[PDB]
Design a protein around this ligand. Structure first.
Ligand SMILES: [Zn+2]
Lengths: 42, 52
């Protein structure tokens, strides 16, 4: 799952050629953070 | 700046050896930056160029 830039939409594209946002036109995508438990030492 | 640059150069006659060809430059206009996407034209921003 990848988040677009100025456009709010999840691309969820894993193809090598699919790098462009759908119905947006821009080619900048941000990887979304899933629900994973991570431990830190305070 | 560009107008004086293009208005200072002088084109000479073109003759490899009657017919002859001469060129000239008129008004110089610069458009705003744009992104040539596959779908259509989009707004272009400095951070778009930085990331891409
Ligand atoms: Zn988008």
């Amino acid at each position: 799952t990848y988040v677009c830039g100025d456009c709010g939409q999840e691309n969820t594209l894993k193809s090598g050629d699919v790098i462009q946002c759908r119905e947006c036109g821009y080619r900048i995508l941000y990887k979304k953070r899933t629900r994973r438990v991570v431990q830190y030492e305070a | 700046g560009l107008q004086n640059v293009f208005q200072s150069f002088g084109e000479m006659l073109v003759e490899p050896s009657w017919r002859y060809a001469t060129v000239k430059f008129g008004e110089v206009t610069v458009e705003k930056p744009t992104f040539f996407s596959d779908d259509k034209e989009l707004e272009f921003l400095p951070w778009h160029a930085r990331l891409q």
